[PDB]
Design a binder for this molecule. Structure first.
Ligand code: CLA
Ligand code: CLA
Ligand code: CLA
Ligand code: CLA
Ligand code: CLA
Ligand code: CLA
Ligand code: CLA
Ligand SMILES: CC1=C(/C=C/C(C)=C/C=C/C(C)=C/C=C/C=C(C)/C=C/C=C(C)/C=C/C2=C(C)CCCC2(C)C)C(C)(C)CCC1
Ligand SMILES: CC1=C(/C=C/C(C)=C/C=C/C(C)=C\C=C\C=C(C)\C=C\C=C(C)\C=C\C2=C(C)CCCC2(C)C)C(C)(C)CCC1
Ligand SMILES: CC1=C(C/C=C(\C)CCC[C@H](C)CCC[C@H](C)CCCC(C)C)C(=O)c2ccccc2C1=O
Ligand SMILES: CC1=C(C/C=C(\C)CCC[C@H](C)CCC[C@H](C)CCCC(C)C)C(=O)c2ccccc2C1=O
Ligand code: SF4
Ligand code: SF4
Lengths: 107, 61, 739, 31, 140, 29, 80, 73, 30
């Protein structure tokens, strides 16, 4: 399944620069990014990121750019929800850009 | 102090440490922290009021 | 109510399976054991340190014995450039007959594993020639490891057990370890090179039988005491010296050519002999500095607490308050352990940076896969030693730190302005990431649209200079040892640049890894490395400095180092502890060393194949990394076993899939958290007490789900093991399948 | 003497974990 | 180095000039970028390698866009700073954050072009920063 | 106060930054 | 079991007693505060570490605190 | 069995068991054997919307000892 | 390779740290 399906059929999606299938080459890499980006929300917790903002609100308090609406980290349920929405988006769009550039070439 | 006096906070464990409050009411005998200070920004719990001692505050008005 | 674990009554009174798991991760934590006093702590760590020391010699003896008995060392002497080394042999009953024929390799009778750790090159360099010296050195390390196993037992007996003041005598360790452990051992190895290894390099056998009769030099120690030391640097091994033969040999034992041997492309053994001799003199002199019972020498506690610079009152050394730091380093063991891992973590990567460019082993620059593995090995070792430096540094601030003893000093002043440290660390991480990712995606879109000339390519003109300020003519900067009229080139008062004619021959050849030619593809990756170093440091420093409490949660010191959270209150506190900032950083630390070893590996796949143009064109945009390195090199690997047959890469093809599976398993412990699983196990506890035959048996420990801190350990363990094994199967077989 | 692989590898594969796990299971479950 | 001979002399840059791809539907947008890129430095590959050194013959790469960016970027900070200075002395200040007081935001936007003349004025008056006794801090 | 000890060492280090650039700009050789 | 420390800063809000689900907490009279009662935890062998009592307390910082200690059967929340 | 809970009801009505599912209390004194004290207070608050505040959680030890633990008075 | 005799010397010598490792690991307590 790795050799003859994922490796062998991706030879049309990553070799597609300088041609009309260039956007599927960019959406293939661009969706590998958003998938990997989602793990920052899934693995980590809220209570780390609230502590980090307290050290950035300080440098925003020092130069008098303190916002009246206080910054907070995303809540525990939302940090899971952001981490699954960015997960499903980048995982499906990888396959979206892989099915097209393979089958708009051999079809 | 009095109802409307801007004070400051020196309690380190408090959220509004070195911030400007506003005294809402001062009690007379008990609790040991008899000063209600209505702050303007909220903590993580969402509230903006707390009790403080008499010597805890720094009057700035 | 059991008596296990012995070191804790709070864990031994646990009815669940939490009793079992927390025994393992608190067993070697000697400081949290029940009734552990202070002097009993040090006396137990000191004898434990004999236990880890004797594992190392028992480990290194199996490298000698499995090569002497199952490898082809004596057949590797005859031609090291084509004979492929052997680590050990396979006895696997589960093999099929086409998988015995595929691993019967390198001229052997049975299935053997090709050694990719380069220990044949190190043993051949230091004089060892036959399989009997390997066996003799193996048996010696059996006795030398048992000499430490007995020493750790001896120093636990009551009148042989050292007192507390023996451990906290820090000025006497620095005199003995610098002069003796560092200096004499560098002196002894210089004695090993000159008496043995350099004569073995010239076809002249010097063993234990005839080293007292034969002299390393026909002058023979008369020019040493008379001061005529230039006799030792007479006629060296010439440029036609065929290694371990008498052709083009010399008589010199301490020489200073600089550069590389012309055949082996390693450093000269006469250069290493004057090196470790000169290192030895610099360290024995360094070990006569600190004050011991002989009433002479510097005193560190007086150097810290000093307040007067030649009459002028100051705050301390460099006018900086360093008082109380002597009672902070020496009294705490986590300050020491957190410190020395940073010291060992710097040098470990510093080993790896200087062993691909300056090879010191015979014929190791041409055995490629042994060289690609040694860089990536000591880079990942340097990763954990740096993460554990901040980890054990942050255990210090929770547990051992005392602000009253450390009042007003330099370590107190860091904790004041800690919000200014984390802010400017958060700036550089965002300032690099917004503009380094921006220029890869800029180059990705521009190449994809068929107009690749619109790339933003920057020459690294500040590291172009240093390579030309070290003597590379290839760029034409014409400065500083590449300018032959320079004051630095000529050494104007004394003209004593002996190393320099041999250095400029090595750096100006395109046949080595010495100061590789850099271009615009190397600009972006060093700024991508700098993204990874400032961001991993951001997580570790912020977890170190906020370890004693902050706004969202004060008094975090009352909860220890590893606690899950403080509940869903105040918006929730998931991953708030100082342990949790160790935890997030090891994703970055494994990431950053991916970047430094994807970039190491693909620049050398162009040098080793003669195609430098593939890297310099395609490493500016992120498809060329993805296509020409990840996709193109994994064709030899994945065809290790197919429906047509197998070959010798089928372990690495199997371990590559094995690594993808351990990696993916660790996501289950991290996305899904505990409370899903305790409500699942409570249905299995139900359906075991109801099944009629299978409820004859029943647990002793009640089954509970893994705790919150535990499956962040177990989740990071499957993640890290799978990260290592995946790349280590790709690094070997993509290099050992192409050569 | 390559026949020692036939007698050390099954002992470490089979006999060493059976002797270790049956000791540790009876040691952790010991009042 | 490495081989930064100028692009007008290269066999590689002139070989990349014959198979030009038109950027915009201008039929000679393929040609009117290669004559413009001739003064830059193309290496062995044929691509202009920018020089961020500060040399004045190479000021167009990094020196000219750096002044151009830092005027525009220090603008957006100064406009966003001076608005938040204004709304703090109002009745609510949280409504004027999400729901923009357009009567106050628009004088601040036009004001901005003397922000180097204002930031240095704010710096020397000591009104750029704040006191460390007036900022909340974490317990040490 | 005018921070003499802070600016004294910052101007020393910046003089090292300008000296190496003089080798790179061929001002000193 | 766990450890429930109650400091002297609370106001007798009775929000922590009405939130601990194993009923560890109770109000005792105490002449300090305005409501003249302080929370007390006389049954900390029943506490399950829920930290509902820390979530419901108004005062900054919290007058009540749960220190997670050795976990017996009553504090693991095991029905078996 | 452990931690019996008793309550006196004015009538019969359908409530929700803490072990999952809906039962029907009698009129008068009731009795429910639950597993833990956490069930009895989570049930005791479900009685509060039925305007019942007469509930008593016991503690039935396996020896037969029944300790009245809620309320204290 | 090495002779068949020399492998048995290596096994008997290896019992000397094997005995001493059992003494150290049990002097460090149970
Ligand atoms: C460098 C490796 C190393 C060393 C030197 C030690 C040393 C020690 N460990 Mg440790 N440990 C280690 C790795 C190590 N551990 C690892 C990887 C784990 C798994 C997480 C553990 C898990 C562990 C537990 C769970 C316990 C120890 C204990 C101990 C102490 C007594 C050992 C004992 O009873 O021997 C047992 C004897 C043998 C195994 C015989 C070996 C004979 C062979 C021929 C000792 C200080 C115990 C203790 O009480 O500490 C004070 C204890 O409870 N350790
Ligand atoms: C001259 C006398 C002397 C000597 C030789 C030593 C030697 C040692 N002491 Mg020590 N000690 C001494 C006096 C001495 N001590 C005195 C007087 C005191 C009391 C004041 C102490 C108190 C003391 C304590 C409390 C402890 C030690 C420990 C150690 C061991 C250090 C760990 C180790 O093996 O690293 C070996 C390190 C080197 C050989 C040098 C490495 C240098 C860098 C890291 C690498 C350089 C290598 C280079 C790159 C090439 C390598 C390549 C090659 C491998 C291929 C080592 C055996 C520790 C230990 O483990 O106990 C057994 C320990 O806990 N000592
Ligand atoms: C600690 C390391 C070490 C040790 C144990 C020895 C030991 C020895 N050397 Mg040696 N040697 C060393 C370092 C060492 N050397 C270094 C660094 C150099 C270079 C300066 C030499 C250069 C040297 C020469 C040139 C000679 C010796 C000789 C000797 C032997 C005579 C002993 C003596 O006079 O004292 C003895 C086996 C002499 C001898 O007769 O060897 C058998 C001899 O001729 N050595
Ligand atoms: C020489 C260096 C050194 C020393 C002496 C120590 C010593 C200590 N550390 Mg430390 N540490 C180190 C390096 C070191 N560490 C490094 C390099 C890191 C970074 C990774 C850390 C990170 C760290 C943390 C985060 C913590 C410690 C803790 C501790 C203390 C208890 C250790 C313990 O409970 O072990 C228990 C041992 C284990 C649980 C081992 C499990 C992990 C193993 C290695 C996984 C192996 C995977 C598997 C076998 C692979 C199989 C492959 C196969 C499938 C193919 C002890 C004082 C803990 C503490 O509380 O300090 C007081 C603590 O919280 N350390
Ligand atoms: C595609 C993957 C990806 C990307 C783009 C980022 C991007 C970022 N992470 Mg992130 N992260 C990721 C995966 C990723 N992360 C994963 C898998 C983890 C492990 C849980 C983390 C853990 C992590 C931490 C703990 C931190 C970041 C930080 C950052 C910021 C660094 C600034 C920058 O370079 O831009 C940025 C928002 C840092 C940050 O925001 O600095 C202010 C920071 O503190 N990330
Ligand atoms: C830790 C070091 C080490 C390791 C990993 C190996 C690894 C291996 N040996 Mg080897 N060996 C070693 C040292 C080592 N050797 C030494 C010093 C000797 C000389 C006595 C031998 C003698 C030897 C023979 C004679 C044979 C092997 C064989 C093997 C293979 C199968 C495993 C087996 O049956 O073990 C065999 C183990 C022994 C005979 C005794 C072990 C000796 C060491 C010193 C014990 C180390 C224990 C360790 C430190 C405890 C810590 C555990 C850790 C998890 C904490 C494997 C390649 C077999 C083979 O090649 O099959 C193809 C085989 O026939 N070995
Ligand atoms: C009023 C606008 C404003 C200003 C002047 C600053 C100023 C500062 N920020 Mg900040 N910041 C802001 C908005 C602002 N910030 C917002 C909205 C966010 C959330 C995305 C952040 C997130 C943030 C982080 C995470 C960090 C800073 C940092 C900094 C400092 C260094 C500059 C920098 O790195 O830029 C950082 C800029 C960004 C991350 C993105 C800029 C946000 C948008 C694009 C600009 C806002 C324009 C505004 C909405 C226009 C309103 C106009 C009004 C009339 C309606 C400096 C004190 C850094 C620091 O502490 O260094 C010491 C740091 O680490 N800030
Ligand atoms: C180039 C060169 C040079 C120079 C060099 C140098 C100068 C170097 C540097 C180096 C360095 C500069 C290094 C550093 C490093 C650092 C680090 C590595 C750090 C870390 C740290 C740590 C980790 C800590 C910890 C802790 C914490 C965290 C908390 C508290 C406690 C403690 C403190 C412990 C010379 C002239 C010689 C020669 C020529 C060339
Ligand atoms: C020339 C050049 C160069 C160099 C550079 C340098 C190195 C620099 C440095 C610099 C520095 C080292 C700086 C620092 C700074 C710091 C600070 C401290 C700042 C300040 C700031 C502030 C304070 C801010 C303010 C503001 C503004 C201005 C606007 C907006 C708003 C705000 C408020 C934000 C290079 C080679 C790259 C390139 C070429 C050219
Ligand atoms: C990174 C991360 C954060 C921090 C990430 C945040 C806060 C994302 C916010 C980023 C956006 C860009 C904030 C937008 C602010 C303004 C709208 C920016 C102005 C720009 C407009 C003009 C478009 C969490 O809060 C969190 C919570 C729970 C689990 C995991 C995580 C987690 O992983
Ligand atoms: C699956 C899973 C469980 C359930 C896992 C349990 C109950 C343990 C299952 C392990 C079984 C017993 C196999 C363990 C044996 C391993 C194959 C090897 C371990 C050998 C060493 C321990 C020596 C959790 O409890 C959990 C808790 C918090 C976050 C995530 C999770 C999580 O993902
Ligand atoms: S601890 Fe909290 S809930 Fe209890 S009396 Fe004090 S403020 Fe009220
Ligand atoms: S542990 Fe916390 S949530 Fe549970 S009963 Fe006690 S105070 Fe309430």
């Amino acid at each position: 399944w790795l050799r003859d399906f994922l490796w062998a059929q991706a030879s049309q999606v990553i070799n597609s620069y300088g041609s009309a299938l260039s956007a599927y080459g960019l959406m293939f890499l661009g969706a590998h990014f958003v998938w990997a980006f989602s793990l920052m929300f899934l693995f980590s917790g809220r209570g780390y990121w609230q502590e980090l903002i307290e050290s950035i609100v300080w440098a925003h308090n020092k130069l008098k750019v303190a916002p009246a609406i206080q910054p907070r980290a995303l809540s525990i349920t939302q940090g899971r929800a952001v981490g699954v929405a960015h997960y499903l988006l980048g995982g499906i769009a990888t396959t979206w850009a892989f099915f097209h550039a393979h089958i708009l070439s051999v079809g | 102090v009095q109802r409307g006096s801007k004070v400051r906070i020196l309690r380190p464990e408090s959220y509004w440490f070195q911030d400007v409050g506003t005294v809402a009411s001062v009690d007379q005998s008990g609790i040991k922290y008899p000063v209600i200070v209505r702050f303007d920004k909220v903590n993580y719990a969402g509230i903006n009021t707390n009790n403080f001692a008499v010597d805890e505050l720094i009057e700035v008005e | 109510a059991t008596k296990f674990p012995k070191f804790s009554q709070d864990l031994a009174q646990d009815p669940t399976t939490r009793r079992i798991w927390y025994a393992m991760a608190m067993g070697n934590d000697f400081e949290s054991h029940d009734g552990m006093t202070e002097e009993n702590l040090y006396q137990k760590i000191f004898a434990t340190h004999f236990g880890h020391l004797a594992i190392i010699f028992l480990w290194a003896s199996s490298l000698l014995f499995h090569v002497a008995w199952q490898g082809n060392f004596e057949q590797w002497i005859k031609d090291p450039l084509h004979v492929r080394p052997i680590a050990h042999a396979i006895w696997d009953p589960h093999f099929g007959k086409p998988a015995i024929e595929a691993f019967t390799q390198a001229g052997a009778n049975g299935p053997v594993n090709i050694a990719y750790s380069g220990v044949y090159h190190w043993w051949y360099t230091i004089g060892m020639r036959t399989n009997t010296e390997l066996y003799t050195g193996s048996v010696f390390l059996l006795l030398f490891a048992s000499l430490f196993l007995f020493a750790g037992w001896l120093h636990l007996q009551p009148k042989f057990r050292p007192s507390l003041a023996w451990f906290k005598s820090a000025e006497s360790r620095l005199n003995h370890h610098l002069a003796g452990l560092f200096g004499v051992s560098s002196l002894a190895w210089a004695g090993h090179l000159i008496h043995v290894a350099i004569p073995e390099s010239r076809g002249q056998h010097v063993g234990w039988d005839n080293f007292l009769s034969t002299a390393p030099h026909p002058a023979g120690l008369q020019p040493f005491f008379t001061g005529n030391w230039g006799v030792y640097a007479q006629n060296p091994d010439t440029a036609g010296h065929i290694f371990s033969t008498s052709q083009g040999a010399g008589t010199a034992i301490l020489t200073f050519l600089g550069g590389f041997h012309p055949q082996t492309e390693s450093l000269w053994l006469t250069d290493m002999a004057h090196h470790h001799l000169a290192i030895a003199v610099l360290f024995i002199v360094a070990g006569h500095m600190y004050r011991t019972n002989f009433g002479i020498g510097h005193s560190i506690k007086e150097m810290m607490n000093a307040k007067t610079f030649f009459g002028k009152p100051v705050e301390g050394p460099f006018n900086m308050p360093h008082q109380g730091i002597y009672d902070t380093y020496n009294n705490s063991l986590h300050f020491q352990l957190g410190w020395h891992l940073a010291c060992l973590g710097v040098v470990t990567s510093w080993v790896a940076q200087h062993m691909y460019s300056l090879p010191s082993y015979a014929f190791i620059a041409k055995d490629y896969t042994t060289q690609a593995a040694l860089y990536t090995h000591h880079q990942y070792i340097a990763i954990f030693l740096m993460v554990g430096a901040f980890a054990h540094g942050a255990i210090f601030l929770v547990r051992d730190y005392d602000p009253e003893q450390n009042k007003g000093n330099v370590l107190e002043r860091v904790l004041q302005h800690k919000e200014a440290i984390i802010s400017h660390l958060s700036w550089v991480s965002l300032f690099l990431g917004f503009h380094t990712l921006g220029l890869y995606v800029h180059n990705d879109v521009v190449v994809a649209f068929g107009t690749p000339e619109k790339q933003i390519l920057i020459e690294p003109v500040f590291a172009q200079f240093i390579q030309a300020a070290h003597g590379k003519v290839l760029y034409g900067l014409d400065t500083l040892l590449s300018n032959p009229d320079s004051v630095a080139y000529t050494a104007y008062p004394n003209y004593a640049n002996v190393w320099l004619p041999g250095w400029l021959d090595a750096i100006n050849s395109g046949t080595n890894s010495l100061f590789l030619t850099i271009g615009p593809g190397d600009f972006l990756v060093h700024h991508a490395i700098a993204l990874g170093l400032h961001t991993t440091t951001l997580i570790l420093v912020k977890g170190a400095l906020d370890a004693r409490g902050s706004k969202l949660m004060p008094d975090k010191k009352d909860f220890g180092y590893a606690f899950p959270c403080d509940g869903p209150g105040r918006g929730g506190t998931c991953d708030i502890s100082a342990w949790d900032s160790f935890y997030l950083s090891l994703f970055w630390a494994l990431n950053t060393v991916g970047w430094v070893t994807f970039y190491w590996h693909w620049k050398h796949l162009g040098i080793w194949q003669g195609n430098v143009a593939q890297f310099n064109e395609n490493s500016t945009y992120l498809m060329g990394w993805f296509r020409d390195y990840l996709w193109a090199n994994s064709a030899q690997l994945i065809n290790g076993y197919n429906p047509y047959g197998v070959n010798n890469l089928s372990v690495w093809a199997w371990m590559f899939l094995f690594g993808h599976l351990v990696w993916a398993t660790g996501f289950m412990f991290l996305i899904s958290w505990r409370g899903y699983w305790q409500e699942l196990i409570e249905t299995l506890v139900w359906a075991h007490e109801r099944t009629p035959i299978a409820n004859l048996v029943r647990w002793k420990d009640k089954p509970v789900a893994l705790s919150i801190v535990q499956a962040r350990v177990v989740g990071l363990a499957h993640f890290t093991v799978g990260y290592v094994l995946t790349y280590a199967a790709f690094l070997i077989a993509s290099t050992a399948g192409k050569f | 003497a390559s026949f020692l692989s036939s007698i050390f590898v099954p002992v470490i594969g089979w006999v060493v974990p059976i002797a270790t796990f049956s000791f540790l299971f009876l040691y952790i479950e010991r009042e | 180095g490495a081989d930064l001979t100028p692009c007008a002399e290269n066999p590689a840059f002139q070989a990349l000039a014959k198979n030009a791809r038109n950027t915009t539907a201008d039929p000679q947008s393929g040609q009117k970028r290669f004559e413009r890129y001739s003064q830059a430095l193309c290496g062995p590959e044929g691509y202009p390698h920018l020089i961020v050194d500060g040399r004045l013959d190479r000021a167009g790469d990094f020196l000219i866009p750096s002044i151009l960016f830092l005027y525009i970027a220090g603008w957006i900070g100064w406009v966003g700073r001076a608005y938040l200075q204004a709304i703090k002395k109002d009745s609510d200040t949280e409504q004027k954050e999400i729901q923009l007081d357009l009567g106050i935001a628009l004088p601040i936007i036009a004001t901005g072009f003397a922000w180097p003349a204002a930031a240095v004025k704010e710096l020397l008056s000591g009104e750029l920063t704040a006191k460390d006794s007036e900022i909340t801090v974490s317990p040490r | 106060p005018p921070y003499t000890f802070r600016t004294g060492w910052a101007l020393l280090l910046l003089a090292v930054n300008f000296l190496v650039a003089a080798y790179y700009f061929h001002i000193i050789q | 079991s766990h450890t429930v420390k109650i400091y002297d800063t609370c106001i007798g809000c009775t929000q922590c007693v009405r939130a601990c689900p194993t009923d560890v907490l109770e109000m005792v009279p105490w002449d300090g505060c305005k409501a003249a009662q302080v929370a007390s935890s006389p049954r900390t062998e029943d506490c399950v570490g829920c930290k509902r009592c820390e979530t419901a307390c108004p005062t900054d910082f919290l007058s009540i605190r749960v220190y997670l200690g050795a976990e017996t059967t009553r504090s693991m929340g095991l029905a078996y | 069995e452990k931690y019996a809970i008793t309550w006196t009801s004015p009538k019969a009505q359908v409530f929700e068991l803490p072990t999952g599912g809906a039962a029907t209390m009698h009129e008068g004194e009731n009795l429910l054997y639950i597993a833990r004290k956490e069930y009895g207070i989570a049930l005791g608050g479900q009685l509060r919307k039925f305007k019942i505040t007469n509930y008593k959680i016991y503690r039935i030890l396996p020896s037969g000892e029944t300790t009245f633990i809620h309320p204290a008075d | 390779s090495i002779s068949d005799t020399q492998v048995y010397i290596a096994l008997v010598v290896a019992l000397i740290p094997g005995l001493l490792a059992w003494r150290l690991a049990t002097e460090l307590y149970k």
